[PDB]
Amino acid sequence: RQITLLECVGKGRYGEVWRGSWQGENVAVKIFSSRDEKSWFRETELYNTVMLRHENILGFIASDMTSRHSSTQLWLITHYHEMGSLYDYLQLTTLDTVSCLRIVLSIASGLAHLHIEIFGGKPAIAHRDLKSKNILVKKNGQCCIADLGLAVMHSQSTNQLDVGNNPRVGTKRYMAPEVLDETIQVDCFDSYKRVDIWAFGLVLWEVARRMVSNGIVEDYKPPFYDVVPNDPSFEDMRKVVCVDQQRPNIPNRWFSDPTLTSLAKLMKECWYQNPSARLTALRIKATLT
Ligand SMILES: Nc1ncnc2c1ncn2[C@@H]1O[C@H](COP(=O)(O)OP(=O)(O)NP(=O)(O)O)[C@@H](O)[C@H]1O
Ligand SMILES: [Mg+2]
Ligand SMILES: [Mg+2]
Ligand SMILES: [Mg+2]
Ligand SMILES: [Mg+2]
């Protein structure tokens, strides 16, 4: 509500995010364009109607409408996290195994807790836009998942699939093949879970490259850096992913470390071209434990 904005710490395609004061404390304030009211709606929807509290999910505080510069602003107020996004984090620092396992574990927990229905409780939720920019790194080393603005929900009791009406689509670079060739089954909640696993496999590759094993690392590179431009188009991503069926190549320096060898095994099982073959968030969480 009555919060003072102190610094804007970044912008994406759907709004700005500010570091602000509430009760003299640091909170993140994502300000939506009214051009993107549907994502502010969907995120407010989940965080108000679903008990969505968990160590590895961005903590919610409030949602509100306010007036600035003679115009209406849609605020989503969440936990501020000093160290920013996994994507920024991976570029400024290298990882050792205990910090790299702590990251991929935390994301695995967050995704699985989203993906399963709890009775007592919460419906099953698929994310639909998971990527390194939509994961935050917290002061205690755990990562959490943010941006529920494209989320779909399913409840076993009703067996009703809630898809929303947001016409926004996922970040093109991270789309699974079934999204790109438009043969995803839109009526089947599990399809959406398998889109998330695929992207998770991409995030996994991003993290592994930055773990120091025998004093060597790769530089941070986004998935398919070598075959598609920045801001790749819908058809750019289709040629690589669907037609020629390329996957990020695994550096064989990783075969000179035991963990990197387990994560290479994890990733490949997240990006089978056949979505039924892909691991679930529940296995991935298990293996990493
Ligand atoms: N809760 C938060 N606390 C601290 N920093 C945040 C928080 N949320 C977002 N940020 C930072 O603000 C940046 C802008 O985020 P955002 O507006 O969500 O766009 P994006 O997620 O980076 N990519 P996109 O929204 O698809 O264009 C992020 O990349 C983070 O670095
Ligand atoms: Mg975002
Ligand atoms: Mg974000
Ligand atoms: Mg969020
Ligand atoms: Mg959103």
Residue numbers in the entry: 206 to 325, 328 to 496
What does the article say, verbatim?
In our C1-dimer model, K493 is involved in the interaction with BMPR2, whereas K492 is rotated away from the center of the dimerization interface. The effects of single-point mutations of K493 and K492 are consistent with the more detailed aspects of our model: ALK2KD-K493A can no longer dimerize with BMPR2, whereas K492A mutation does not have much effect. Hence, K493 emerges as an interaction “hot-spot” on the ALK2 side of the dimer interface. The inhibitory effect on signaling was also selective to the mutation of K493, while the mutation of K492 did not have a significant effect upon BMP4 treatment. The strong effect on signaling of the K493A mutation located in helix I of ALK2 prompted us to examine if this mutation promotes any specific structural changes to the ALK2 kinase domain structure. We crystallized the ALK2KD-K493A mutant and solved its structure at 2.4 Å resolution in complex with ATP analogue, AMPPNP. We also obtained crystal structures of the ALK2KD-KK in the presence of AMPPNP and the ALK2 kinase inhibitor, LDN-193189. Hence, the disruptive effect of these mutations on BMP4-induced ALK2/BMPR2 signaling underscores a functional role of the C-lobe-mediated ALK2/BMPR2 heterodimer in the formation of an active receptor complex.
Here, using hydrogen deuterium exchange mass spectrometry (HDX-MS), small angle X-ray scattering (SAXS) and molecular dynamics (MD) simulations, combined with analysis of SMAD signaling, we show that the kinase domain of the type I receptor ALK2 and type II receptor BMPR2 form a heterodimeric complex via their C-terminal lobes. Formation of this dimer is essential for ligand-induced receptor signaling and is targeted by mutations in BMPR2 in patients with pulmonary arterial hypertension (PAH). We further show that the type I/type II kinase domain heterodimer serves as the scaffold for assembly of the active tetrameric receptor complexes to enable phosphorylation of the GS domain and activation of SMADs.
